[PDB]
Structure formats: C-alpha cells, structure tokens
CSV table of C-alpha atoms in Angstrom, one decimal:
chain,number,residue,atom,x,y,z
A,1,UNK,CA,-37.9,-26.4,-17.8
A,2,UNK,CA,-36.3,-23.0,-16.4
A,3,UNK,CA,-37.0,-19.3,-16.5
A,4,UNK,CA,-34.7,-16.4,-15.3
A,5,UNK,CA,-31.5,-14.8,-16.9
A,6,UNK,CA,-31.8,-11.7,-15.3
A,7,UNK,CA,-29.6,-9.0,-14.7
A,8,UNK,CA,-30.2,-5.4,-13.4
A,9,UNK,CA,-28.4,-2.8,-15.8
A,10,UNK,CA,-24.7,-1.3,-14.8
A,11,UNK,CA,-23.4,1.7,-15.1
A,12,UNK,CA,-20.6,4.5,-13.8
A,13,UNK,CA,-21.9,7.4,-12.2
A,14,UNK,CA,-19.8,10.4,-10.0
A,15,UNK,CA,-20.1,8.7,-6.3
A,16,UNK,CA,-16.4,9.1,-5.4
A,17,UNK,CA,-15.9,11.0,-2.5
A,18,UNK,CA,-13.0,11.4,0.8
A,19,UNK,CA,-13.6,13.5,3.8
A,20,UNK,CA,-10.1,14.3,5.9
A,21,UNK,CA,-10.6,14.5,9.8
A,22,UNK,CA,-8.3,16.0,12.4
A,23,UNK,CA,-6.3,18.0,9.4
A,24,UNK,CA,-3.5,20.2,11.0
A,25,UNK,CA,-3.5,24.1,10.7
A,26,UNK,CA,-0.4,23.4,8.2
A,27,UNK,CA,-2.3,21.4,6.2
A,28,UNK,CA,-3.9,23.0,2.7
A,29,UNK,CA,-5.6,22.8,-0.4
A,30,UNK,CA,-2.6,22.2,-2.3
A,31,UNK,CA,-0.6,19.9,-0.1
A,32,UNK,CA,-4.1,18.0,1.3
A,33,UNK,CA,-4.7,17.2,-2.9
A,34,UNK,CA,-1.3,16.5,-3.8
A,35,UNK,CA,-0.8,13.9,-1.0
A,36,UNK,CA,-4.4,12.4,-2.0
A,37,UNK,CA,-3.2,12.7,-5.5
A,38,UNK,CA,-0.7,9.7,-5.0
A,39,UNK,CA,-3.4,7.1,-4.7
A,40,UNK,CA,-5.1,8.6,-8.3
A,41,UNK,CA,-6.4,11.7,-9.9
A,42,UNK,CA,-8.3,14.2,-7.8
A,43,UNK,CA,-11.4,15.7,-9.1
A,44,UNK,CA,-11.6,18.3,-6.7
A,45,UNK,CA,-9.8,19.0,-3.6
A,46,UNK,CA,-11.9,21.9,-1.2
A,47,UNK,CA,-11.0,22.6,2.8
A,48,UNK,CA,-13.6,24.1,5.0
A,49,UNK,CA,-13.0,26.9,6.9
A,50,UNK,CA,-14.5,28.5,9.9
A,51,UNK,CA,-17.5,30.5,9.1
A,52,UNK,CA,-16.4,33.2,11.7
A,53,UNK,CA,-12.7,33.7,10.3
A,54,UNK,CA,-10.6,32.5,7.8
A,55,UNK,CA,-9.5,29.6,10.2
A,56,UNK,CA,-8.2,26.7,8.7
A,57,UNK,CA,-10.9,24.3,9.8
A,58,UNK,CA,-9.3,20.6,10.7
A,59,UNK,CA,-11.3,19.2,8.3
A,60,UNK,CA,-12.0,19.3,4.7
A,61,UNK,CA,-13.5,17.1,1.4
A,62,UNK,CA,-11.8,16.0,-2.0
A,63,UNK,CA,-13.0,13.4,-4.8
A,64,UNK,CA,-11.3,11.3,-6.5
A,65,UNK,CA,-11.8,10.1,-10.3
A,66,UNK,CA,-12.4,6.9,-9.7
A,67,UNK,CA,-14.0,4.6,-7.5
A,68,UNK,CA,-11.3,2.2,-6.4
A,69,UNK,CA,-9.4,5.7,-5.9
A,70,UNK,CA,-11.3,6.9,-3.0
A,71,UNK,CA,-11.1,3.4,-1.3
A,72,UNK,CA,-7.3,3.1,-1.5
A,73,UNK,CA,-6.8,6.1,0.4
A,74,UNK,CA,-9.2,4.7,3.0
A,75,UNK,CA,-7.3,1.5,3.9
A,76,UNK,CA,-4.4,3.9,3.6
A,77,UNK,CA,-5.5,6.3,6.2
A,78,UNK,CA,-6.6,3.6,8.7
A,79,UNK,CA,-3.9,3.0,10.9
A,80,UNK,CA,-5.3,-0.3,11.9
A,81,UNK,CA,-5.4,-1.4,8.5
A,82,UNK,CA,-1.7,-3.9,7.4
A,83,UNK,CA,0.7,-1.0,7.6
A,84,UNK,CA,-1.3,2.3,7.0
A,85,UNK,CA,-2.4,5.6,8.9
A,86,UNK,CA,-1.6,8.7,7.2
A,87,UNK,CA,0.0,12.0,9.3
A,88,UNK,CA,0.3,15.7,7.6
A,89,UNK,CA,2.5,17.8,9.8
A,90,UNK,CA,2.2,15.8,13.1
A,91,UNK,CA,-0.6,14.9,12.5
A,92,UNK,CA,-2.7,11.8,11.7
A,93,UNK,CA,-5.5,12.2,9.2
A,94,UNK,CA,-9.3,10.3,9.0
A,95,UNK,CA,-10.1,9.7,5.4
A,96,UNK,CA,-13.6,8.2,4.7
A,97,UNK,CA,-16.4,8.2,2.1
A,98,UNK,CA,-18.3,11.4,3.0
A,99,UNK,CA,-21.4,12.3,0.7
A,100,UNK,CA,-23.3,15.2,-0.2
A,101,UNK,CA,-26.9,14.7,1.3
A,102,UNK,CA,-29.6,17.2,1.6
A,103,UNK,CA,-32.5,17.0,4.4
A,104,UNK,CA,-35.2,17.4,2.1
A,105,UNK,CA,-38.3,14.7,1.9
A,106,UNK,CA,-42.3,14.5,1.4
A,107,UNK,CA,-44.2,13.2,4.6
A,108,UNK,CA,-47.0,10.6,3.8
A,109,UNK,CA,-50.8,11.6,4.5
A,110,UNK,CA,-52.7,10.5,7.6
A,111,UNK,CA,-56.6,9.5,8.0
C-alpha cells in the first residue's frame, strides 16, 4: 500500500528580466535593445539616466519575452563563461537578472 501523486500546479508568469552594468556613454536605447534582441524578443528595453542631467547613466534594464531569453544573454555576457563577454563601444557589458522589488512589509506584534 502507497499514497502520494502529488504535484504543485505550473504556470508562466512575466519574471524575465536583464540589467546591463558598466554601459558606455555611446551606448542607447536603441542599440542596447537591438544587441539584446539577437538572443530573442525584447519586451522592453529602458536606460537610466542621471537624475541631475540628462547623463547617459552606465547602466540600464530590458526584458526579454521569454525566460530561457534572459538567461542566454547572461552566459553570453559573462566573459568567463566558454567563449562569451559582451563589449558595446569599448566596452564590456554586465548582464544579469535584475528585479523589480519594493521595501514595503508589515512588522509582527510584540508582548
């Protein structure tokens, strides 16, 4: 005699993401996307820039459509990874799996 079968439930949900380190002043929107674009669709592609001027910030965040998206442009960006490392204009470029997380929670009661 046995009991079990179980199985917790699976779904797709958005939780693609790619933030870009050390991104050169000649780096932009449109290039940054289009050379993330090669690995599979882009969702959206946004750059940061500095909240005192327009200043091309050396970093920025894009998603990609699909999960195994994102993660090919990781191995692809790491250097150290069998023959990878990206570089936009002189430049190497840190691609990882950023997230949007907001510092917001409910403290438990004391005595």
């Amino acid at each position: 005699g046995s009991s079990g079968s179980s199985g917790l439930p699976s779904d797709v949900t958005e939780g693609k993401t790619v933030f870009i380190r050390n991104l050169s002043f000649d780096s932009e929107e449109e290039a940054l996307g289009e050379v993330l674009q090669q690995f599979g669709d882009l969702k959206y592609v946004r750059v940061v820039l500095h909240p005192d001027t327009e200043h091309s910030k050396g970093c920025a965040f894009a998603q990609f459509m699909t999960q195994e998206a994102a993660q090919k442009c990781l191995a692809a960006a790491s250097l150290e990874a069998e023959g990878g490392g990206l570089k936009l204009d002189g430049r190497q470029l840190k691609v990882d799996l950023a997230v949007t997380r907001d510092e917001a929670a409910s403290g438990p009661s004391s005595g």
